[model samples]
Target: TLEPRGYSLLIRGLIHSDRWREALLLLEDIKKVITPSKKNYNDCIQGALLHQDVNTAWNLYQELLGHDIVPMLETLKAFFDFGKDIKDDNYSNKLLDILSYLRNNQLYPGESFAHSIKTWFESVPGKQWKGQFTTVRKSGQCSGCGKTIESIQLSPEEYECLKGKIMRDVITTPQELKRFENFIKSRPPFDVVIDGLNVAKMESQLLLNVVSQLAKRNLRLLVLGRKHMLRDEMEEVQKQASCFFADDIDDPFLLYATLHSGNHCRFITRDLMDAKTQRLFFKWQQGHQLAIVSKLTFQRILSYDTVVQTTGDSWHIPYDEDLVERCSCEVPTKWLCLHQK
Candidate 1:
């Protein structure tokens, strides 16, 4: 590991925390030592935002996007948050403005940010339940159920954490995003339950909203993992709905697709995917022209007991009371659903 990745992320975190001097130092180091990569671009744009240098931020954002690599939703969201206060008319044509044009008019020409996030998480082992966890070495069909095909992609962190435990990339390209979406469109409502202590909580909520809006109207919920991470994690989730160990998926998008195909609307997630995971969703959405709802949209739908709720049946939205995480948990977002359905 040349560690450019490490320095880049460090710059981002430093900038976000308002450590301007340190962030700049890291940026310089990256410019001199690390090749210009998406990670470096991410650091600059984020650092620019941290310093409130909207003009520079916009320029760097453009370069980052120009490479045609996956763009980050978090980075976009940051630009949006700070661009409002900038009064520089000269920079009106900045990247923030371009992002604004695209976002408002729905002119996104690249893959889904959702997919990018998935890729960042990289591939890893899914939840090991009932001794079901296995390395996502390659994909084909798991023997757990009849003809139960398993094509998944996990984030790098997850994959690394799961090395040798019970997960490997077993599936390849057989199962696909279209098949998954088609499955979701065709099936009646089903359950989706996800387990993870923190960030995964977001997915729990999104899955619930996604399915509830579908024609089937299924219950969707997210649950935090057992504090002990014991057998209960699997047993408890299974008792409620279909289970997903974001930690074990070979390809999260495919898993996302499969969940769609099962006619199960819910998508249990341990956390969001890394950049690699986006390949599945980004690739699929490009071919299908379908929309990938945002985290904000997902949060909004949670309030309504469903999503784009006005859409009517075929996309029935249903919320569950049990999926929410507790306040004591470390996850910044509640992403929890409970005490109210």
Candidate 2:
């Protein structure tokens, strides 16, 4: 008998990498090698349907029933993909019936599955159904699906109520900040992300002043801090800069936000994230090599006098360029500075 673990792993790998034909053939081989499990069949069906192989998906669906296998919501999701293969026919009507069954059963086939059905119908050469079957109704009516929703009219105001404008202001307070983190990954990338708690509790009080000045300036920065005594000042700082409450241990909400933004912006904090993580950041150079800085050190960087024009306008004062170079192992140095003797 085929090893379920290995067989599933390989098939999943092929499907994930978009090697659709190869995966399809492998599933057929698995059927002969051993009795394939229901999940294996469901996974292959999902992949085949996603790749728009409706005939294979339909055959698998029928085979699954013969083996007394009831489809999961995901399996039903694949059925929705059948629309892409059909132009205009009774098959289309049957597809709608399947979706209706799921809707009536109170089993959500997920947004993607619902979206596919909407796309299939709305793509027809007409305008009346442009907005049909797009909205998913949980309680009152599924506005997006016309076959399900009857005689429902949404005014411009009602539609706007569904889709609200983006919020620019920072979400203060702990309760709202947690909610904010859930959506931070979806937020637009920032130019700079401040380790709010890190910067707030930095040893250098002078840095807070500089930060206040920086915050009140023409900089678009997102600062993360926890609820603390300095919250009043933090709010004031946010008057010019955007601020959010952070509560992650090693880095807090800043780490997640930075990662979500794909590290396109520099992170500002005094914490020298160990050697491995340190490689992820660099020292500040006006607007290059995203680096973190503290108040005391921030002033030092601001006071640095330039030496030679090091590489395309990224040279910081090379006060201790040699020493800075001597400190690291095989890493590129964007900016280097040493204390005056």
Candidate 3:
């Protein structure tokens, strides 16, 4: 009468009680009954490593991959932990393969995994190395080593691909689609799009301040908001920028306005959830979205120039140094520069 969930719980219990061998055996037994979940494999794999059973752990890792179950970050970090101080060339190469896999897939590591990477590099045989954590300059330059870091800039073809995906996946409604198309044709080109409600709720007069700030630079603006935001006190906003108010949610409209506004357009908001989707759409273009950092004042925080770069003899890797907020892509804003001491 045991379900798959019950079996996973049994495996977890066995692993917690230090019966890792039995847990591994139980996973094998459960596989015959139902396909083991990623958690089941991860628990047993981690438990095996906790007991210094690297061979079994490696086998389980490969088995997990064979079953098309992507290993969790903790599971990968466990492998990195084992690789640290390992003198075997074969295992060292395998660890490097993991790092390569992460880079190839644009997978950004958290603090612990990044630490494991640093340790693995330091423990390599016969190497004198030094590392410093620094911030990337706004100009896409590494602060520690003075190298130009590469930010994510989509090519024309990729931009077209992104536009197609957004139009098809995001603005799916017939009415919304036709309305957005007409809106784009009717308005002149916009340089900035502000999520009106998101900014207005942050502080009084904040949206007006933002509009004023950008307007001074001679940028055409489009603001999306709710019907209630169309108050008499906001007459300046209506005069300075083209304003559109919706009866319901304004996020989709904001996105449509921003994305369709061409490559140079920027949007400002403090909201992270919508920003996450925007990040995915832009493929982590740091400069395209601005975040509001000050609640009491209108200060726009642009994205950091966080990217991996390498020069003749030095390398710069971006990581989440403080483990602060991260986007859906897991890329951090801090950098770890490594070079020979």
On lDDT, the leading prediction is: 3
Residues 33-110 of candidate 1: C-alpha lDDT, one tens digit per residue: 644566667667777777767767777776666656555555755553454454454443453354333333222312
Give the alpha carbon lDDT tens digit for every residue of 112-148 in model 3: 7777767776776676656677777777667887766
**Ten contiguous residues minimizing lDDT sum, candidate 3:** 295-304
Poorest 10 consecutive residues by lDDT, candidate 2: 308-317
How well does candidate 3 match the true structure, expressed as C-alpha RMSD? 5.4
Indicate whether candidate 2 or candidate 3 has the larger lDDT: 3
Residue range 1-341, candidate 2, lDDT tens digits? 55545777777777655676676677777777676677777778877777766778777877876776656766765665666556766556656555444323323334455455445545544322332222223342223221221212223443233212212223235675567676675567766677755565533243356456665555557777665635344455666556675443343455445544542455666534232112112221222223334233332222121221112111111112223343221222222211111
In order, candidate lDDTs are: 0.39, 0.48, 0.69
Those runs of model 1 whose alpha carbons end farther than 4 Å from true positions after fitting are 4-6, 16-22, 31-40, 88-92, 95-97, 100-341
Candidates ranked by lDDT, best first? 3, 2, 1
Estimate the TM-score of every prediction.
0.29, 0.33, 0.69
Tell how far residue 292 is off in model 1, in angstroms: 18
The C-alpha local distance difference test score for the whole of candidate 3 amounts to 0.69
What is the Å distance of residue 326 in model 1 from its true position?
A: 25
